Amino acid sequence: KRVLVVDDEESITSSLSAILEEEGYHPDTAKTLREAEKKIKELFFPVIVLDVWMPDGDGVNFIDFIKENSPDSVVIVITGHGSVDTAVKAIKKGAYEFLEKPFSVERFLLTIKHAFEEYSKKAPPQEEIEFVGEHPKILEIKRLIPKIAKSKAPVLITGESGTGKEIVARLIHRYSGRKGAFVDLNCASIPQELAESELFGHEKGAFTGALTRKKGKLELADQGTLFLDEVGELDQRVQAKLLRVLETGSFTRLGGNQKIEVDIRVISATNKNLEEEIKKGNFREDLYYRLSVFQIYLPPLRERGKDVILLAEYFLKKFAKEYKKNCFELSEETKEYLMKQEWKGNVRELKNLIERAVILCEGEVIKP
Amino acid sequence: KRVLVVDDEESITSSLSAILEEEGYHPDTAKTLREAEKKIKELFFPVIVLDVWMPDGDGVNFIDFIKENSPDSVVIVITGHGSVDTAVKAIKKGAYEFLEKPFSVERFLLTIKHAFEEYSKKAPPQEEIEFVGEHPKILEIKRLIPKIAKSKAPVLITGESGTGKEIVARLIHRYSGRKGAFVDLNCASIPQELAESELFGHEKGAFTGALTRKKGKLELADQGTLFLDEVGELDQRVQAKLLRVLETGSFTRLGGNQKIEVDIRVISATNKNLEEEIKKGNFREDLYYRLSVFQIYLPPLRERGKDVILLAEYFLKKFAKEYKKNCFELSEETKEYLMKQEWKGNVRELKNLIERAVILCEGEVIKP
C-alpha cells in the first residue's frame, strides 16, 4: 500500500509520513514537482497526495502529468485555508478528493481510506459479446438494436428456444449506456412461486424462518437492465405485482413495508405468442403492452440460411481452442449435413452438438 | 434519487434541500429523530444526512436505528466545528463520512456524490458454486479447501481435462475471503505470443501499432486470485518472468518501466505431471516449488464411484428445468450404462452428454 506525498513543507511530508507509516501504509515523499515526476514514472503509487501549490510549477496542472503517466493513481489535493476554488479546479481536472488545511489526523486517515477503496473499485466487464450471423434477417436485427437501446421503453424479444434472446438483451444493455447491472431472471427455471421472491427480495423471514434480508432482482437492476426470460411463465399474481411496479416505479420487499424506488430498463423474452396468451387469459393485457413498446423477432436457426455454418465454425474454433483439440475445419460433408437439420433446439442444440464433436475429437470433424 | 436531511435547524434543512434539489436529487427533511424514524421505515433513502446533535435524542446513536431499519443507507453526519471527536464516534458506529460545519456547497456536493458512489458500488451478493460429489476422495478435497484457502501460498491443482479444476479454484478463492477479482488465464487457449502480453500488459507501440495501454492479468488479479489454467503450457521465457514476479512481488508492463506491485494469490492447474516436465527440462524446478506449496489432486470421473450418477442427476435436473422440459428421471439401465464408461473428457464430457439428452428429450425418462 504505497502513498506518494508531494508538498513543499516538512510539516506536511513528515507528519503525513509518520501517520501513514503508523497506519500500515508505506509512504514516500517528493518535495518538488521535479522530484515527484521522477518517482511517478519510476514506481506506481495507488494514491498520491498533492499540494495545490508547488515551487517548480502549478500543482493543479500537475494533475495532468499524473493523468498521463499514472492513470490509475487516485489523487487527493491539499489546499490552503479558505482557498477551495483551487480545490474545485483540481477536482474538475480529475482529482478524487481534497483536504483543506488545517485538518486533523482522523480526517486525513479517513480520506486516505476512501482513496484506496476508490482505487480498489474498478469495473472489469470488458467482455465483448459475440452475435454471429450474416443472414439479412439477422443483419436487420443488428442495425435495429442500437436504435432501440438508448430508450428506456421496454423491449419484448420473441423467438423460439435457444435463438439467442439473451445475447440480444445484453447487446441492448451494452448500447443503452446504462451504468447499472444486467440482471437476468428466468421465470420458468424458477419454482412456481419462488419467482415473486427472486424479484422482490425478502426481509425479516418472508420464507419459513429466515430473518435474513435478501435483495430482489428489481433492486439489483437499479440504473441497469432487468432481463425477464420467458416472462410468459409468470404467475398471474406476479404479473399483477410486476405491473404495479412498472406503473408506480416503486415496490416493497416480501415481509417489509419500506418503499423502494427503482430505475430499470425492462427487457423481456418469450417463446410464446403472447397476444394469444392474453386471449386465453394466461397473461395480462395491460402488462403486455407495457412490456412491448418495442419488439424484436429472432427467427429460428433453420430460417437463417448459412448462419448455421458460421455458427458451427465459431463454436468449433472456440471449443477446439479451449479443450486443446486439433480439429479446426468442418468437412464439406459436415457442412451439408448441418444444412439439412431442422434444429428444433436452434442454436442451443447446434452449440451442444459441436461441443460434443470436439470432446470426442480427431484431426478434422466429420458427421455421424 | 432520494436524500433525507435530518437536522434541527431550519436554515440547514432548507438550504441543503434546495442544493440537493438543484443538483437532481429528491430531498426530504426531518426536524426530529421521531420524524426521521417515521420516514425511514416507510421510505428507503440511499443517502441520509444526519446532524450528530438532535433535540429529541442522541444523533450518533441513531446510526444504529438506521443500520437496523435501512441497512443499505449511506450516512453522512454533520458536526460542529472542532467537535470532530463526535464525528469519529459516528464513523466508528458505521457512518460513511462526516462534514464539519461550516462547509462550502462544493464540499457538501462532493461528499454527496461520493456517498452515492458508495451506495451504488456493490458486489452481486448472489453466488453459488456447485461442487457435486460424495466419493470419499471428493469429500476429502471438500474438507481441505476451506483450510488451504485462508493462506496466501500458491495452490497447484492436478487432474485430467474436465475434472473441475476451475471450480475448486473458485471455491478456494471464495473461502479465502480475498476481496479482489478471480482472474482466469488459460495458458493454452492463448497463442504462444499473447502469453507474455496477457499476463503483464503493455502501453506504447511495442508490437505492431499497440499504442493503447492494456492491463495485465497480474494487475487485474490485485488483492484477488490469479488462476493459471494449464500452467505447464507456458514457455520457459514466461516461466522465468512469472517466477520473478512471485519472488519480488512486482513487475513492469511491456514497453513500460514503471514498477507495479501486486498482491495476488496464485492458483495453477495442470493435466500433466510437472515433476516429470522438470526432468524433461520443460518446466523450472524453482517455479514449480513456488506454485506447489499446496497441492490438490482431482481424480478422473471414472475413479469416483457413484458420483457419475450423482452428477448425471444433477445436470439432468438443471437442464430439464432450464430448457423447459420434463425428463427428470434416469432409468436404471441408463445408470448402468453410465457406470461403464471411461469418460476421457470427464465431467465436461458427462455434462455435455446429459445436456444433449435433455435437448433431444421426449418423455420423462432417459434410456439410451
Ligand SMILES: Nc1ncnc2c1ncn2[C@@H]1O[C@H](COP(=O)(O)OP(=O)(O)O)[C@@H](O)[C@H]1O
Ligand atoms: N447468434 C449467436 N452468436 C453466437 N452465439 C450464440 C448466438 N445465439 C446463441 N448463442 C449461444 O448459444 C447458446 C444459445 O442459447 P441462448 O442464447 O441462451 O438462447 P435463448 O436465450 O434464446 O433461450 C448460448 O450459449 C449463447 O451463448
Ligand SMILES: Nc1ncnc2c1ncn2[C@@H]1O[C@H](COP(=O)(O)OP(=O)(O)O)[C@@H](O)[C@H]1O
Ligand atoms: N463436481 C462438479 N459438480 C458440478 N459441476 C461440475 C463439477 N465438475 C465440473 N463441473 C462442471 O463441468 C464443466 C467442466 O469443468 P471445468 O472446471 O471446466 O474442468 P477443468 O477446469 O477440470 O478442465 C464446468 O462447466 C463445471 O462447472
Ligand code: NA
Ligand atoms: Na499443463
